[PDB]
Design a protein around this nucleic acid. Structure first.
Length: 53
RNA sequence: AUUGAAAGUUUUUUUUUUUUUUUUUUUUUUUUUUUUUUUUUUUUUUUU
């Protein structure tokens, strides 16, 4: 079932801090998409000066 | 029934003319439409 407990105000002072995690992939195959289906142009060759298009 | 009387104090004459209640006198002098308010929270680019 659901425990309908009263909410805690955000202004009330509890504990504040930053914890740094470390995410590791164990199965060497991880993909999270972004909806894109095109190239990423990694090298980004800018050799259009001598021949422009 | 007088000594004994019968006569309008009347006719006629415009209190009228000249003269702008006028000139000058700015309903203005000052005053910030500012002032506190996070366009914020919820949502796994994803399966037979």
């Amino acid at each position: 079932p659901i425990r309908r407990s009263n909410y805690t105000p955000r202004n009330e002072k509890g504990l504040e801090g930053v914890i740094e995690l470390q995410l590791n992939v164990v199965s060497d195959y991880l993909h999270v998409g972004s909806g894109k289906y095109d190239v990423e142009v990694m090298r980004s060759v800018s050799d259009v000066k001598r021949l422009v298009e």
